[PDB]
Design a protein around this ligand. Structure first.
Ligand SMILES: Nc1ncnc2c1ncn2[C@H]1CC[C@@H](COP(=O)(O)OP(=O)(O)OP(=O)(O)O)O1
Ligand SMILES: [Mg+2]
Ligand SMILES: [Mg+2]
Ligand SMILES: [Mg+2]
Lengths: 105, 680
DNA sequence: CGCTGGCACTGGCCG
DNA sequence: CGGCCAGTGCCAG
């Protein structure tokens, strides 16, 4: 249920998609990123109706993150109509994310 | 004999005022101070000592005190003052000869902490005078509410300055006596603090005389400076900076940027067991946060990172991109980091063609920064050292190497790129007599470059003549030896034929040899045999050295423990030449011999010119611009004079060879032209 | 075991 | 962010 982005697919898969898109900028070497991955898998099944969870691996796609000021990871950018609507950084708990989402959708 | 020291308002280049001076007369055993108003009297005292055929001792007076007094004498009193070289003694020159196994701060110009080994105590205290006086100033100062500025401790005289001056003389005296107590350089029968100048030079070891003359002449060279074409180098900088910008553009398109961990302030811990995981990037836990527009929560840890652009100058980055491209290092370093140099870079192979080609851009990029660094951006760059007279006055330590060789710095005019290398002609042409216009006529001067032919091989010949009855010496004088060695080793260029032998003759490993001449360890072995076999006397000479220095040694771990019979060798002039390692013993012998030969040579050369009536100086007929081990570059007022210098250089060399009874004829090769590019 | 040297640039550490 | 310093690698003879 999760989208896997690339530098070239980013524009049309995110900035030109309809509705909300939850982007996760992560990396294989980060402990916090490894912790949050599990959560995101479930957040995908559940919000299958009003949300799209998409991930971008900053090592394999070095061009996108810079344009956003990535300073820490995992970074969760919430896009709506090709525009960053919200954003939070760190390994949120399954119980904290759902809130962040609910309170923004 | 008197010991003296002076305090002035600035370095030689711009000194303009005499502050104070102190003199200790061994004859009266008393100390005498001289304040600003006593400048004429201080100078008289010195000339009085000269009128008696006496000696004046300074610590580093050959480069500063003596020439500073001449300048200050003309500016402040309209007096002509010129201490004769034969009346001056320099404890720094002496200290450097008798403790040549030790480093020194070059009178505070270097920081003692970055120097290896120990330092002679008295000399240390002397080289730290200024800084210690400065620290006292800022202190005495701030304890007054004032503010410290630039280097105001030198603008005016003061009793604190007077005391240090006195202290320097008392320490210089102590330093003198400890040096005079070394029976190897000064025979114990004579009390050297109580004899005329002629006795001091004639009864002491010949090295004491050679070091003071060389020092006196090289201080003159430093004062002459080297005519430098600033405009040519500024325009060279522009070319290179442009070429640098383009290679970066290309490379940064090929190798993109990436993120790295930075600012992690907490050990990462497994959520289930609590087990610490050091290998993971450090994290950071927010505290606070949880609409709340802020972008943080509370117990939600993250990993702080930074964006980093590919930097061709960083060996780390290079090593990281090429491995990702498919490279697997085979050569690593002590610390386990892979080796990234031109040698391995030239042999790295990858699939992506663009990446493979990028490698050349990387090698060209590094070489260009090497040029920009030396000529423009580095701390000791040429463009930063060019004086107002259009000349660069590089510093020279006449006896800075263990072997007796000199050392050069600020900047090192002895490491300028050769004409047969990337951008060498431009660098080389920028230094030259043509860039000096005559004070009267305004016409350019001319250069005379003289270099000693096959120097160290002739030194080898000399030392092995007692084993081969003069054979090697005979073959040497049968055409260029380096060219006869080139074809023999089936080598490409003559410079490379030189690198070979000198690597061969001083114990370079088979691999090292093969690399230079650049096949495998098999090549660098057949070549070691071919030449070592074509001359077995080199084997005899090596054994003697060993049997003369070493008694036996171990190999306990990564180091070396040796039992010596004597850890030094006697130089061509009788001084002690410290032998750091048994394997380098031969090198010490030949390099030391060559050095001492070139030192007497330049000394005898200038002495013969001044004898032919020529005047040394830009206001004369010729001027020493540089001395690079076995090469000298001299500026001449007319083509006619450059012809004489050259001719004369050859006469002096043959003289030196006779002086020390060398078993191999010595020769020189001179070139006349407008700059260093054409004169080497 | 090349050896003598100077020196530049990167990257970790700290006031 | 500039000073201290180790680790590296190049320039000359
Ligand atoms: N790679 C080296 N290793 C050790 N010593 C060297 C090396 N290259 C040169 N030397 C020594 C040899 C004597 C001194 C000056 O050498 P220089 O470069 O003038 O060559 P050379 O004097 O042997 O012959 P030439 O007549 O070609 O100048 O430095
Ligand atoms: Mg002094
Ligand atoms: Mg030579
Ligand atoms: Mg030379």
């Amino acid at each position: 249920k999760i989208i896997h982005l690339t530098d070239d697919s980013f524009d049309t898969d995110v900035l030109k998609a309809d509705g909300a898109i939850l982007v996760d900028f992560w990396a294989e070497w980060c402990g916090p990123c490894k912790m949050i991955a599990p959560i995101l898998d479930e957040i995908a099944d559940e919000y299958q109706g009003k949300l799209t969870v998409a991930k971008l691996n900053i090592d394999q796609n070095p061009g996108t993150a810079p344009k956003y000021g990535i300073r820490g990871i995992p970074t969760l950018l919430l896009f709506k109509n090709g525009e960053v609507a919200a954003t939070k950084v760190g390994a949120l708990s399954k119980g904290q994310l759902k809130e962040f989402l609910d309170a923004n959708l | 004999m008197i010991v003296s020291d002076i305090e002035a308002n600035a370095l030689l280049e711009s000194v303009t005022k005499f502050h104070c001076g102190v003199i200790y007369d061994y004859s009266t055993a008393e100390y005498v101070s001289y304040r600003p108003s006593d400048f004429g009297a201080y100078l008289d005292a010195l000339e009085a000592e000269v009128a008696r055929g006496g000696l004046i001792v300074f610590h580093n007076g050959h480069k500063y005190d003596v020439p500073a007094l001449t300048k200050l004498a003309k500016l402040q009193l309209n007096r002509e003052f010129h201490l004769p070289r034969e009346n001056c003694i320099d404890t720094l020159v002496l200290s450097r000869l008798i403790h040549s196994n030790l480093k020194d701060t070059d009178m505070g110009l270097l920081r003692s902490g970055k120097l290896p080994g120990a330092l002679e105590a008295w000399g240390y205290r002397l080289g730290e005078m200024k800084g210690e006086y400065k620290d006292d100033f800022k202190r005495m100062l701030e304890e007054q509410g004032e503010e410290y500025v630039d280097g105001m401790e030198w603008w005016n005289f003061n009793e604190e300055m007077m005391d240090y001056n006195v202290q320097d003389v008392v320490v210089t005296k102590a330093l003198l006596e400890k040096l005079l107590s070394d029976k190897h350089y000064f025979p114990p029968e004579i009390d050297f603090t109580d004899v005329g100048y002629t006795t001091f030079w004639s009864e002491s070891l010949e090295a004491v005389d050679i070091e003071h003359r060389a020092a006196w002449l090289l201080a003159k060279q430093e004062r002459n400076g080297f005519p430098f074409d600033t405009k040519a180098i500024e325009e060279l900088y522009v070319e290179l900076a442009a070429r640098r910008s383009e290679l970066l553009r290309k490379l940064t398109e090929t190798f993109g940027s990436w993120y790295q961990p930075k600012g992690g302030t907490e050990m990462f811990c497994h959520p289930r067991t609590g087990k610490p995981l050091p290998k993971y990037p450090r994290i950071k836990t927010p505290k606070v946060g949880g609409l709340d527009t802020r972008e943080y929560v509370a117990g939600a840890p993250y990993t702080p990172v930074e964006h980093v652009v590919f930097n061709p100058s960083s060996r780390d980055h290079i090593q990281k991109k090429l491995q990702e491209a498919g490279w697997v290092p085979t050569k690593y370093t002590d610390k386990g980091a892979p080796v990234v140099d031109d040698e391995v870079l030239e042999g790295v192979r990858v699939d992506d063609p663009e990446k493979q080609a990028a490698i050349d851009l990387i090698k060209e990029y590094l070489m260009i920064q090497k040029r920009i660094g030396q000529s423009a951006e580095g701390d000791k760059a040429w463009l930063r050292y060019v004086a107002e007279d259009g000349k660069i006055h590089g510093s020279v330590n006449p006896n800075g190497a263990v072997t007796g060789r000199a050392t050069h710095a600020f900047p090192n005019l002895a490491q300028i790129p050769g004409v047969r290398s990337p951008y060498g002609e431009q660098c080389r042409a920028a230094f030259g007599a043509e860039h000096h216009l005559d004070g009267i006529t305004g016409k350019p001067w001319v250069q005379a470059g003289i270099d000693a032919s096959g120097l160290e091989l002739r030194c080898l010949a000399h030392f092995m003549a007692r084993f081969d009855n003069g054979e090697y010496a005979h073959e040497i004088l049968n055409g260029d030896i380096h060219t006869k060695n080139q074809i023999a080793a089936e080598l490409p260029t003559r410079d490379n034929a030189k690198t070979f032998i000198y690597g061969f003759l001083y114990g370079a490993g088979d691999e090292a040899i093969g690399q230079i001449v650049g096949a495998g360890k098999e090549r660098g072995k057949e070549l070691k045999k071919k030449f070592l076999e074509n001359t077995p006397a080199i084997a005899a000479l090596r054994e003697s050295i060993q049997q003369t220095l070493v008694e036996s040694s171990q190999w306990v771990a990564g180091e070396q423990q040796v039992k010596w019979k004597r850890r030094w060798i006697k130089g061509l002039d009788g001084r002690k030449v410290h032998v750091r390692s048994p394997h380098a013993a031969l090198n010490t012998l030949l390099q030391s011999a060559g050095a001492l030969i070139c030192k007497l040579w330049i000394i005898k050369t200038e002495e013969m010119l001044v004898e032919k009536g020529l005047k040394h100086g830009w206001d004369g007929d010729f001027a020493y611009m540089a001395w690079v081990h076995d090469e000298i570059q001299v500026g001449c007022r007319t083509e006619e004079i450059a012809q004489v210098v050259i001719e004369t250089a050859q006469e002096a060399m043959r003289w030196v060879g006779d002086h020390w009874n060398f078993r191999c004829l010595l020769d020189t090769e001179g070139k006349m032209g407008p700059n260093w590019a054409i004169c080497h």
